[PDB]
Design a protein around this ligand. Sequence first.
Ligand SMILES: Nc1ncnc2c1ncn2[C@@H]1O[C@H](COP(=O)(O)OP(=O)(O)NP(=O)(O)O)[C@@H](O)[C@H]1O
Ligand SMILES: Nc1ncnc2c1ncn2[C@@H]1O[C@H](COP(=O)(O)OP(=O)(O)NP(=O)(O)O)[C@@H](O)[C@H]1O
Ligand SMILES: O=C(C[C@@H]1CCCCN1)Cn1cnc2cc(Cl)c(F)cc2c1=O
Ligand SMILES: O=C(C[C@@H]1CCCCN1)Cn1cnc2cc(Cl)c(F)cc2c1=O
Ligand SMILES: [Mg+2]
Ligand SMILES: [Mg+2]
Ligand SMILES: [Mg+2]
Ligand SMILES: [Mg+2]
Lengths: 562, 562
Amino acid sequence: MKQSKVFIPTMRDVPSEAEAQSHRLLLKSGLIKQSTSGIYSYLPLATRVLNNITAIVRQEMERIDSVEILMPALQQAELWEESGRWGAYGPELMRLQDRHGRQFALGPTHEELVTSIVRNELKSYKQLPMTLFQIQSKFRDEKRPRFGLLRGREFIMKDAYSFHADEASLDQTYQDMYQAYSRIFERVGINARPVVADSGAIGGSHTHEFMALSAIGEDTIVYSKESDYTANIEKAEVVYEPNHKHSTVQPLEKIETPNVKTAQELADFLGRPVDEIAKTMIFKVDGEYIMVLVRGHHEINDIKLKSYFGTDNIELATQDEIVNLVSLGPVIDKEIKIYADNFVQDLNNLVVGANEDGYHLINVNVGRDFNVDEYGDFRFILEGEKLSDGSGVAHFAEGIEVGQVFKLGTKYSESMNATFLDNQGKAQPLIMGCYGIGISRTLSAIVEQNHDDNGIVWPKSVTPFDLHLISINPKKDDQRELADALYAEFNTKFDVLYDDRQERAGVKFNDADLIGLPLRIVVGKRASEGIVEVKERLTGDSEEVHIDDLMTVITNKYDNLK
Amino acid sequence: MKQSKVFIPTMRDVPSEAEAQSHRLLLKSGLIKQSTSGIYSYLPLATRVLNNITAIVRQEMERIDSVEILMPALQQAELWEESGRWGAYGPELMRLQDRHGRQFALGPTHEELVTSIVRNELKSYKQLPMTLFQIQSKFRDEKRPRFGLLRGREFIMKDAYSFHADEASLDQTYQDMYQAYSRIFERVGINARPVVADSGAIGGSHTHEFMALSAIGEDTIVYSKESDYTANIEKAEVVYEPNHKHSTVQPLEKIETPNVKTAQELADFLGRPVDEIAKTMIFKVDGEYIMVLVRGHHEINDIKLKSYFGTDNIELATQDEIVNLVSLGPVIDKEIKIYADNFVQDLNNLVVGANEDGYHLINVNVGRDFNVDEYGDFRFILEGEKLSDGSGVAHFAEGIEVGQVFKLGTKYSESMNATFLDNQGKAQPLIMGCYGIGISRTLSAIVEQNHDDNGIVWPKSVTPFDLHLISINPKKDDQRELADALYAEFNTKFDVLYDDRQERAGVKFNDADLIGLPLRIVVGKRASEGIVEVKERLTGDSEEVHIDDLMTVITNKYDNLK
Ligand SMILES: Nc1ncnc2c1ncn2[C@@H]1O[C@H](COP(=O)(O)OP(=O)(O)NP(=O)(O)O)[C@@H](O)[C@H]1O
Ligand SMILES: Nc1ncnc2c1ncn2[C@@H]1O[C@H](COP(=O)(O)OP(=O)(O)NP(=O)(O)O)[C@@H](O)[C@H]1O
Ligand SMILES: O=C(C[C@@H]1CCCCN1)Cn1cnc2cc(Cl)c(F)cc2c1=O
Ligand SMILES: O=C(C[C@@H]1CCCCN1)Cn1cnc2cc(Cl)c(F)cc2c1=O
Ligand SMILES: [Mg+2]
Ligand SMILES: [Mg+2]
Ligand SMILES: [Mg+2]
Ligand SMILES: [Mg+2]
């Protein structure tokens, strides 16, 4: 393509709104444009990168016999009522009515839709297993869209769904997808790690998140240097090995604590270490209010709470609810269940809130002053603590969730009545797997890991064009004519972006750095001599090359790119 | 792909609901599945055909420097308010609210969205022209979804938009698109014709519809055998050359006409020819009621009415409105404007309704009994009539509108303030073109023209697989082992669908006819001898071939397919 015919609205200055480097760079390089909050258009160069990503995805899917389909965004509410998800989800599910008052969801995902395709069509065990996937735009009314393509409200997902006669078949396809995903991410230029993920409040089947290792990552991975242990910090179990810090039991005193809000402020006010303070939060779980206690150096992990209680309906109590009910503390007259993290047992003579502003309690002891109804693992692991598998020490790394693989089992097939006749000839619900890659999120993740201060540095596998051909001054006949000839010579074997614009060299080069193609061929002053400059985007190395050498010099350099 | 791993839910019996052969065949062959009215899922084989179609489209777009983008389905209402289309369109525009009460449209098309991308980015004449396209799913709440993919509510369109400094530039890109479209349709196996289309009520710029010539087609093309004249019957002008049929003027009589509703019934009741009767319809146009008169052998063309009056707000009057106001006729006491088709002037002594059930008027004469306020071309041309260009006689052919090219001009750029600095350095609105192909409709059109009674007969260019490899009985080691070997040999150069199923030959062959791959390789009883049968889907020709000959026999046959 001639660059004069390609829409690439490069920016001079990026807004301070934009925080993530991928978002800033995708804006600055003219690759995306925001329509409104979390809704973007993919401009020409981004679309070419998307096409390269999806081609790779399609190859890896076909390699494991995952077969492409395309399902609708408009999904009738009756389908979501069959599964029970219509009522289970709130404002994140985008909903609408058609001209006859019939209700629809815009698809956030397609479990019901695919199940509706397959039911009474996958009739026999002889047709199983079956794996289907699409690359399609999903809709989720995210509470907080942010970081550009990392969290949009309309986004591209590759979603796959597999159907099985038994657990062993599912296990096989799960493994195939796991391995395919690893290959996908490596091929597109992402350093990713699969990590054990939380299976939800109610379920317990296996699931792995694929995490692009990057500092902007909102997820934390817990990993071993000794074993292959890798878990999301939400999931990572803390094993409690008793190590008591008990001192001689003292009597309960209420004390004045002016302007003290936080646990660390309290610690500093009392001259005690923060770990000796116990914090109290109030949660509402399936209707009823509870107390959860953790040590001052720890934080409550509400994914663990959800899994512990076996419910998703867990939220913190509001200011009003806390007032109506009751710095908070566990010494209260009301009949309320009190839960404590296991590591609270290493202390006695607790420091807690008084349920009375300006006051805290000291020397509070369990059994005497209040009772803990149940102990458990309700917190995040800390870096340095012993891992649950006994392998060694916990290390953290940040991560972007670029994909996930799930064993679903029979949830949808039982609720929506999707059965097959087994080996014995009796009706059984389809065993399902499901697997997803954030395609637009992955595009951003590629950028996060493949850039410098001057712009994007696209991997060879996904770069929108292979070579940037640049004439310094096309008013000069020798430059223009040479560059024209080179375009013709190179644009058969390669995809060439030819910067043919009547535009100052400075802006062409600036644009070229932002766009980030791996190799640059500059035609300038030495065009008469048949000499051009070849520049590498990654290293910034530059060398002069005569045109008769150019095909082999470029071919060799291209072949040796990562 | 092994067919055991591909979801292809072939049917025994198609519902009587399904009317169009493409719809019936796409259902029966396991290519689409209806989710709800006008909303389909594309199953594996259809998705492969879609991918082949879009690849061809992408090549032809790149050939004319049309550059791919991807714009969102969710479009904020504020954008549609800028253009005025939010208020101009009714229930066909699908609308919704997000979780903060902000209003959106699901995109039925993207004029506003693309204009919002380009505005203040295409800043100078030096950047023009620019052409952008996407392949993306559109949403229209069609009053009457029908004929499967021919009229859905969610459908795939390729939509392109071009931006220009002057009319000559637009004319150039319009021509490029016109030519590209012709190539696209020929390559995908469609016999199509470009035809002059109606430019809307208000506009007068050029537009051509691309019509797939097929009997299920709801459009009628008017064409010359002498010239290149081709117009949609909605557009095709009728030139009135006077040819009076006048008889001696007679006095107005009201007559009894029991059980006579239609013009033909009236003609038969009176023993007169139907062309001597004049029909009267009441229309509401921009608020006010009018009468339109046509001869009994003619029909009112309300696209012509819309163009004549320069408004889209034209509808027939309801039963109540007709009652409140007034077989209908033009002899009425009320002050109402009466319009007549030009060919009414060839008659005198008109036969009309009486505005009184059970009665009609005879010997009604213009000037005496009522006045015609204006004469015009308000009807459809008939087959046999002289064409507007004087080239010769009108012939009809049926057609499916598979695409359209439009000159838009400055409608959106003026309403949405999208300007560029011209040669003189002064702000001017962008001159726009827009161009669309119904991708999913085209898929159906391919089927309509490429099938027989036993199933689909896919053109080589779009067939989901190239060769159907079929083992008659895979329990036989020699058949299975031979077919396995052939799969490996052929599935590098070709895409092979390998029917490896444990399934009776009869159903394999039936399935194979429905699926419609151009060449079939059958491995059966003569597998031990290294002999297979090669069968052509189009002709039904069959011949025996030894395996050492097979690569060249298949390659030659494949190369000689259309
Ligand atoms: N709002 C979004 N924008 C872009 N990509 C997304 C979004 N939500 C999910 N994805 C991607 O789609 C994949 C599968 O979706 P899913 O597992 O439902 O995401 P999720 O668990 O809701 N992730 P998150 O919302 O980031 O906690 C994820 O691994 C992401 O890569
Ligand atoms: N409801 C639909 N289902 C499938 N394809 C469609 C539909 N509407 C339009 N298309 C296709 O999209 C192309 C461009 O859209 P457009 O010109 O807006 O269609 P349109 O004039 O509304 N056609 P119609 O509704 O059939 O009179 C058309 O040429 C069709 O091929
Ligand atoms: O979508 C998944 C899991 C996998 C991911 C890969 C493809 C198959 N699905 C999980 N999830 C997340 N957010 C959701 C949001 C809404 Cl509004 C919803 F209604 C449903 C879901 C929902 O189910
Ligand atoms: O879409 C087009 C014309 C071209 C076709 C090719 C791509 C660019 N657009 C015409 N049209 C048709 N039906 C519509 C329906 C609704 Cl609900 C709407 F709001 C708008 C339109 C509308 O504008
Ligand atoms: Mg989410
Ligand atoms: Mg997830
Ligand atoms: Mg329409
Ligand atoms: Mg049209």
